[PDB]
Design an enzyme around this catalytic site. Structure first.
Site, short mmCIF file in Angstrom:
data_model
loop_
_atom_site.label_atom_id
_atom_site.label_comp_id
_atom_site.label_asym_id
_atom_site.label_seq_id
_atom_site.Cartn_x
_atom_site.Cartn_y
_atom_site.Cartn_z
N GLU A 206 0.82 -1.20 0.00
CA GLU A 206 0.00 0.00 0.00
C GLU A 206 0.86 1.26 0.00
OE1 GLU A 206 -1.28 2.28 3.02
OE2 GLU A 206 -3.35 1.58 3.07
N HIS A 207 2.03 1.21 0.64
CA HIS A 207 2.93 2.36 0.60
C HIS A 207 3.44 2.61 -0.81
CE1 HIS A 207 4.42 4.75 4.06
NE2 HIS A 207 3.69 3.90 4.75
N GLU B 111 8.19 5.38 10.84
CA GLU B 111 6.80 5.38 11.31
C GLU B 111 6.61 4.41 12.47
OE1 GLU B 111 4.12 4.66 8.13
OE2 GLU B 111 4.53 6.56 7.10
#
Lengths: 20, 446, 105, 423, 20, 146
Positions: B60-61, B137
């Site tokens: 998804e990144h 993150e």
């Protein structure tokens, strides 16, 4: 005579109240 | 001149069709000029083993980082050529990509989405850069205490099953994920029977169907060999997890029990019951006159900074409970009042509070679906969970059939004398022992 | 000033003087029993009326300690007794009855 | 297909009140009352009156008590909300279709006849310390409030929240005066979505007409400019540099909006590189550290601020601000490409259309137009006006920015941020 | 997208958290 | 700090210096509130180590003999060498700081850059100070010559 005229001085002491 | 029932009947109906490869195309016409179009996929962290956990978040990144036909940062520019908003998200059971744009850009916008979910180039340098960003993150996610406590609740509640695994995955896995693993994940999970192409706004159904036939006919939907990932029932465990960090100012606590699941009739009743308990924040304006006894007591006595109730659904399981943020000298009071309210619902519920909760659920359901993005999200989730979109008239019919007896029976079924799961983070020295929490799940008087 | 009215007011003034709290400088509302409605009403009083109530009660307790009364000139005249507390207590009662009425439905 | 959307009915009563309705057939209804009672109408002797008035919506009124209002609103599942910018206040009520008649009774009682009892107002004072604190958890709010204080002198300088020294000192007399002076018929607008026109007209004629007796007029915005620097030793330095731009509802305002979207107004893609954003690409060429920058625009009835906002680490703040200022200068000199102007115009059109899709956004836009111009403009006319902007007007706006008295605000470890003279 | 770009607004509600 | 800051003159004069200068002389005599609790022992060590040196010090004495002071200086203040930290010259800026606090009275100070101490111009400024009026000389007087 409350208006300031001269720059501030901060005093601290071991056994005397502080002053400005 | 109009009425509530007439207004509910007047909403236009969703129209659904299915292509040959297995793709499902749903849409809902409207008179607005804008529109939202997206692709929902039935693939999250639950379909991942320990070896490749966090693969979906990694993919998804890398979605908006160029493809075979739009290399580099060209794709992004194309979106901003038309002033559209391209967004995505991933959860423990679903993934979604979508675009908000005008009606006129419906041909181009769809042509972008088919590009994203088929031709992920996955440049190696981009993989290394996103690996570094994901590590940053993971380091920075420790600052959000609510999300930490929810991850702890999932880990303890569903220990030893796929539902314990977090979406981002452990920091060790991301350091070892290779392009082979990402390609295998994409080749295994992204397939036409598991995708839904939803749209909502100003458009016509046949145009979207024709565009889908143009740009999505290449997806394979044969389920090659026995590569058919199917979920299994997940064991729930009553247990406690406590992270003691006395340096922090506030304590976060989350307590839950096992829920019914996505497609059970009971859920509506539970949604009424939670609406009776309500929610509170220190900035609310009602004060001590709030209808909920828990909210009024917390406001007058200052028991907590905030609390809320949740009902999170999965396939054939879920969490049902509460979460509060409070001082380190108020945890016993909050737990006592919360469990007392649950027992009150289980043993003795009256008509007036149930009517109030029904009205709250009606208003929330009406107001949540007002726009284009929430409607598209509703279509996308419904077509994967129920297999069809439930009209609002059916929701009103289901809600209107609840009364005090049904709420009492459902609450007695799911709350009374059950082993809960508890997660605490911060200065939690005053949190009761697990035996005390367990003994608070019934009454000697009843 | 008719037949029954002047007789009723005469009996009320008789009883007022017979009660005798005026001999300690007190007013009627100073003597009320403090329940939750009265504690709330007292809480809502403005600064000046509160301070006057405090000093009158303190002077009366001092007299009762000394088993004395004020001179006759300083007794609270029946016609000048001010019901400073009545409107606040009335509002507090009206609010509590509204709450009780909502709890029945 | 569904019935065609009916036209937005619009009316201006003889007393000055404006009433607007739109009769769709959604399940829910939304009614809003908009007043020109922002924080700019406070003088220096009653600061924080508007903030307390915003939180005093649930207090006792002549029509009904606090208990009755709260319990009745929550019984039918309705929602009551109050919003306030520097220029306007908006009381909004949302509910189901067959519950407006009850809630319409509450809303006017909140507005046309409050009491402000002493003990109730006193009990509400500590809330002003809580809410403000929450609003100050975000550094942007603090920096923007300081920026408004620095740019303007009298009217728009007033903060949205109470000054910390004045908390607990607001009395019922101030609130009574504020409501009696500012809540009047000529300064009000009543918008409805999901109810008919005669119902609103009857309600307004019965109640909102007596409130007339139009009072004060307010000051005028005086622009001065200046600096405010507040050091607090946080990880990242926030800064904002602006200048006088234009008044809302004017030809130059559209030019400033187009310039805002040329420069950059945040990302359109999740975790995007902001490839089209000229400012981000100009700054990122030199600075090789994480940062962020965007264009800032804020228009009011008589004045407006245009500029840019930056977030960057302490060592690199000067580099970021210098690079952004240089990029705006190059745009001002004349270097601008027509494809980029068209792309910015498309961004502006898409953003404006997508803003008013929801009931909340539509009601807010209609109320703002009703108060400002006293007439409703459909979206098509706005689109035509946006397309009518000539590319030379953007250059003129850049020239107005580059040759004007700047106003700067900053926060963080201000060991390397420049002053205005250094730029 | 952390940078402010539009004039600030203050919201207060009966049964919703306040926002800015 | 709180005891010091209940005189309004100390607030005003500290803000006056903050508004006048860009650095060094802009700094306050009192610790900023956000730093209370964050000053570390290492910072104190570095400050003493790089400011308390022989070339920056002077030992003055009344009622003491000169050989005694010279002996103390030669014995114990010889290990304070190692000069450094030339600091930075004070760059006068100009500006205004306004503090709305609703006090009973308004205090205000308005100044400009005048002259460094030790210069002949400083004597002229001192005389101008006493022409304009520096402070009162008579108890409950009208300040006739001011």
């Amino acid at each position: 005579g409350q208006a300031a005229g001269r720059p501030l001085v901060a005093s601290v002491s071991l056994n005397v109240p502080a002053s400005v | 001149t109009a009425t509530y029932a007439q207004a509910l009947q007047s909403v236009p109906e969703t129209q659904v069709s299915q292509l040959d490869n297995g793709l499902r195309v749903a849409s809902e016409q409207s008179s607005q000029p804008t529109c939202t179009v997206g692709v929902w996929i039935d693939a999250g962290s639950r379909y991942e083993s320990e070896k490749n956990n966090g693969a979906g978040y990694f993919v998804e990144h890398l979605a908006f980082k160029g493809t075979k036909n739009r290399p580099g940062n060209a794709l992004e520019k194309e979106v901003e050529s038309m002033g559209a908003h391209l967004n995505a998200y991933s959860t423990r059971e679903h993934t979604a990509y979508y675009i908000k744009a005008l009606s006129k850009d419906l041909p181009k916008a769809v042509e972008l989405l088919a590009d994203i979910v088929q031709n992920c180039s996955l440049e190696d340098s981009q993989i290394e850069k996103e690996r570094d960003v994901i590590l940053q993150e993971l380091q920075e996610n420790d600052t959000s205490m609510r999300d930490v406590v929810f991850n702890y609740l999932h880990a303890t509640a569903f220990q030893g099953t796929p539902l314990a695994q977090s979406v981002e995955g452990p920091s060790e896995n991301v350091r070892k994920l290779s392009r082979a693993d990402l390609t295998e994940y994409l080749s295994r999970h992204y397939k036409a029977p598991r995708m839904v192409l939803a749209a909502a706004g100003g458009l016509e159904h046949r145009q979207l169907l024709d565009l889908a036939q143009k740009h999505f006919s290449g997806l394979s939907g044969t389920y090659d060999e026995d590569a058919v990932p199917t979920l299994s029932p997940c064991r729930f465990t009553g247990s406690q997890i406590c992270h003691r960090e006395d340096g922090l100012p506030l304590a976060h606590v989350a307590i839950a029990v096992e829920g019914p699941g996505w497609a059970h009739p009971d859920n509506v009743a539970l949604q009424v019951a939670n609406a009776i308990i309500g929610h509170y924040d220190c900035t609310y304006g009602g004060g001590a006159h709030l209808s909920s006894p828990l909210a009024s007591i917390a406001a007058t006595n200052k028991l907590c900074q905030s609390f809320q109730t949740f009902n999170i659904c999965y396939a054939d399981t879920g969490l049902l409970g509460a979460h509060f943020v409070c001082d380190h000298m108020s945890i016993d009071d909050m737990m006592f009042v919360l469990q007392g309210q649950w027992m009150r619902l289980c043993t003795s519920a009256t008509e007036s509070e149930v009517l109030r909760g029904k009205n709250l659920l009606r208003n929330a359901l009406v107001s949540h679906l007002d726009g284009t993005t929430p409607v598209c999200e509703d279509i996308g989730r419904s077509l994967l969970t129920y297999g069809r979109r439930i009209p609002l008239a059916e929701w009103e019919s289901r809600i209107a059939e609840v009364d005090a007896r049904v709420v009492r029976e459902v609450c007695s079924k799911y709350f009374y004398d059950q082993c809960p799961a508890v997660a605490g983070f911060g200065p939690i020295e005053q949190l009761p022992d697990y035996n005390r929490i367990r003994s608070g799940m019934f009454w000697l008087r009843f | 000033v008719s037949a029954s009215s002047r007789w009723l007011e005469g009996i009320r003034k008789w009883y007022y003087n017979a009660a005798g709290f005026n001999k300690l400088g007190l007013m009627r509302d100073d003597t009320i029993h403090e329940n939750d409605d009265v504690k709330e009403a007292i809480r809502r009083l403005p600064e000046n009326l509160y301070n006057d109530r405090v000093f009158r009660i303190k002077r009366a307790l001092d007299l009762s300690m000394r088993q004395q009364i004020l001179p006759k000139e300083q007794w609270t005249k029946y016609e000048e007794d001010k019901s400073y507390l009545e409107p606040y207590l009335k509002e507090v009662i009206r609010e509590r009855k509204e709450r009780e009425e909502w709890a029945k439905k | 297909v569904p019935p065609h959307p009916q036209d937005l009915e619009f009316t201006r009563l003889p007393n000055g009140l404006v009433i607007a309705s739109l009769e769709n057939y959604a399940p829910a209804s939304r009614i809003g009352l908009f007043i020109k009672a922002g924080s700019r109408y406070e003088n220096s002797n009653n600061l924080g009156t508007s903030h307390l008035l915003r939180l005093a919506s649930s207090l006792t009124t002549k029509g009904a008590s606090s208990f009755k209002i709260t319990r009745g609103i929550e019984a039918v599942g309705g929602k009551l909300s109050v919003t306030s910018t520097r220029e306007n206040m908006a009381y909004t009520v949302e509910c189901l279709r067959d519950d407006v008649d009850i809630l319409m009774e509450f809303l006017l009682n909140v507005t046309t006849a409050p009491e402000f009892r002493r003990w109730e107002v006193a009990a509400l004072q500590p809330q002003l310390r809580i809410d403000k604190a929450v609003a100050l958890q975000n550094p942007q709010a603090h920096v923007i409030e300081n920026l408004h204080a620095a740019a303007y002198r009298n009217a728009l300088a007033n903060s949205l929240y109470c000054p910390d020294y004045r908390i607990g000192k607001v009395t019922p007399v101030e609130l009574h005066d504020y409501v009696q002076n500012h809540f009047t018929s000529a300064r009000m607008a009543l918008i409805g979505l999901g109810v008919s026109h005669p119902v609103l007209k009857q309600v307004a004629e019965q109640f909102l007409n007596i409130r007339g007796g139009l009072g004060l007029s307010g000051a005028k915005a005086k622009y001065h400019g200046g600096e405010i620097r507040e050091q607090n030793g946080d990880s990242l330095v926030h800064a904002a540099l602006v200048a006088e731009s234009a008044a809302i509802g004017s030809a130059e305002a559209n030019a400033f909006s187009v310039l805002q979207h040329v420069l950059g107004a945040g990302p359109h893609v999740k975790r995007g590189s902001n490839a089209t954003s000229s400012l981000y690409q100009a700054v990122a060429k030199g600075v090789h550290q994480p940062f962020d920058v965007s264009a800032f625009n804020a228009s009011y009835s008589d004045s407006g601020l245009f500029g840019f906002y930056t977030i960057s680490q302490a060592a690199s703040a000067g580099d970021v601000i210098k690079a952004a200022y240089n990029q705006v200068k190059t745009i001002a000199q004349g270097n601008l490409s027509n494809p980029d102007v068209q792309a910015a115009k498309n961004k502006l059109k898409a953003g404006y259309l997508m803003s008013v899709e929801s009931s909340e956004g539509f009601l807010d836009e209609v109320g703002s137009q009703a108060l400002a111009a006293g007439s409703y403009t459909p979206p098509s006319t706005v689109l035509q006006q946006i397309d009518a902007v000539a590319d030379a007007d953007v250059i003129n706006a850049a020239k107005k920015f580059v040759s004007g008295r700047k106003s700067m605000a900053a926060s963080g470890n201000l060991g390397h941020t420049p002053f205005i003279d250094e730029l």
